[PDB]
């Protein structure tokens, strides 16, 4: 009965969960942790990943 008031809540909760999910996901890089990049590469070539 109350199903169109949960679709908006579920779509917003999904959008918020998907946005956080894309944080632990690197894009053609070493890892998805910023602290694991500066201390694992040289400063000059650090700002290419």
């Amino acid at each position: 009965a109350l199903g169109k008031l949960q679709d908006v809540v579920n779509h917003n909760a999904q959008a918020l969960n998907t946005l956080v999910k894309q944080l632990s996901s690197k894009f053609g890089a070493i890892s998805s942790v910023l602290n694991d990049i500066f201390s694992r590469l040289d400063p000059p070539e650090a700002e290419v990943q």
Partner: protein, 49 residues
């Protein structure tokens, strides 16, 4: 300067070490050209170490 050895690659934007740390250090930009060449024809003075 008269730095010798494999530390020539250390003389560059970043890439720290033993030579490019406590003797001389280029910025993280270094807008220019690094010119190096062999000098084992005039610096062969062991006396003037």
């Amino acid at each position: 300067f008269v730095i010798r050895g494999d530390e020539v690659r250390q003389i560059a934007p970043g890439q720290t070490g033993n030579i490019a740390d406590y003797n001389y250090k280029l910025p993280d930009d270094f807008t220019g050209c690094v010119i190096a060449w062999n000098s084992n024809k005039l610096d062969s003075k062991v006396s003037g170490n």
